[PDB]
Amino acid sequence: ATASSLNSVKDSLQRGQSTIDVALAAGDTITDLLTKMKEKALAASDTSLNTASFN
């Protein structure tokens, strides 16, 4: 009964790994977007741009 009981534990573990995989797949996009936002704020910090490039 214990040996047959372990299959649900294995299923829950694979389900948790799949959920973490989806989380990392979203985190890749979130990280590249944060990097592009840092690049935009860094370029915008400069005072040599005119108003149009700032907007």
Added chain:
Amino acid sequence: ATASSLNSVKDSLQRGQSTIDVALAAGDTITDLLTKMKEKALAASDTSLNTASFN
């Protein structure tokens, strides 16, 4: 007469053996359903399941 009386005793013992056999034949099914019920309770305990899987 005492020797002849024992045939009824053997009949009662065989009757009890048959009744216990029927009880064990039902207990096989009862234990199997109990094991599957334990597996369902294990799967239901997980917090990562959606409402339809729990239902």
